[PDB]
């Protein structure tokens, strides 16, 4: 359910802080509305209100149509502008990790292999690693700027 | 840094379906909640003073 992870789901830039405040503050205030508030309709004490009134028929007119039906301030799932972003977005970052971030992981395990063990044969093996090696140093300095 | 963001990323990406629906479903209920007490304290401060 995560303040712990939902704060530090961002990267590196500072960009994300403004929709990421923006968020956390709409979703406090829209648990807080739903529990302050009542959550049921309404009394309608009509046993006291037609014996109270001067005017005949008054009270018991304005109790029938209350309790039927009306209209409220809502709206529909038609405008999904929120649900089409989250798929897109997947694609470009939790589908580009498939081939970005499962490289580095193979690549890494192959340099450690090979710097660490035939003898001439092994070495030169490992010179082409370790030119990536040296390569991916200077990138992730790069990525992080 | 890259395999955590990963996750972090696909999580922030689902969470804005669902803070945006989370807060139109909320202000439905508190328009049902306000119009409904509008209409009983209405009733019943005409139902006092007329008592």
């Given at each position: 359910?995560?303040?712990?992870?939902?704060?530090?789901?961002?990267?590196?830039?500072?960009?994300?802080?403004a929709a990421l405040?923006?968020?956390?503050?709409?979703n406090?205030?829209?648990?807080?509305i739903?529990?302050?508030?009542?959550?049921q309709p309404?009394?309608?004490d009509?046993a006291?209100?037609?014996?109270?009134?001067?005017?005949?028929?008054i009270?018991?007119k304005?109790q029938?149509?209350?309790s039927?039906?009306?209209?409220?301030?809502?709206?529909?799932?038609?405008?999904?502008?929120?649900?089409?972003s989250?798929?897109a977005?997947?694609?470009e970052?939790?589908k580009?990790?498939?081939?970005?971030?499962?490289?580095e992981?193979?690549d890494?395990?192959?340099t450690?292999?090979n710097?660490?063990?035939?003898?001439?044969?092994?070495?030169?093996?490992?010179?082409?690693?370790?030119?990536?090696?040296?390569?991916?140093?200077?990138?992730?300095?790069?990525?992080?700027? | 840094?890259?395999?955590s963001?990963?996750?972090?990323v696909?999580?922030?990406?689902?969470?804005?379906f669902?803070?945006?629906?989370?807060t139109?479903?909320?202000?439905?209920?508190?328009?049902?909640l306000?119009q409904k007490?509008?209409?009983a304290?209405?009733?019943?401060?005409?139902?006092?003073?007329?008592?």
């Amino acid at each position: 359910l995560d303040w712990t992870k939902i704060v530090s789901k961002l990267g590196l830039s500072g960009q994300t802080a403004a929709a990421l405040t923006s968020f956390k503050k709409r979703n406090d205030e829209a648990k807080r509305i739903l529990f302050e508030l009542k959550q049921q309709p309404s009394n309608v004490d009509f046993a006291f209100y037609k014996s109270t009134l001067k005017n005949t028929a008054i009270v018991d007119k304005i109790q029938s149509d209350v309790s039927k039906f009306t209209p409220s301030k809502a709206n529909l799932s038609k405008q999904l502008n929120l649900i089409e972003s989250f798929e897109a977005k997947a694609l470009e970052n939790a589908k580009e990790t498939e081939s970005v971030v499962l490289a580095e992981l193979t690549d890494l395990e192959k340099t450690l292999e090979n710097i660490e063990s035939x003898x001439x044969x092994x070495x030169x093996x490992x010179x082409x690693x370790x030119x990536x090696x040296x390569x991916x140093x200077x990138x992730x300095x790069x990525x992080x700027x | 840094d890259q395999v955590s963001n990963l996750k972090d990323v696909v999580s922030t990406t689902k969470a804005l379906f669902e803070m945006s629906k989370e807060t139109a479903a909320l202000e439905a209920e508190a328009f049902e909640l306000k119009q409904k007490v509008a209409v009983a304290s209405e009733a019943k401060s005409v139902l006092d003073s007329w008592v």
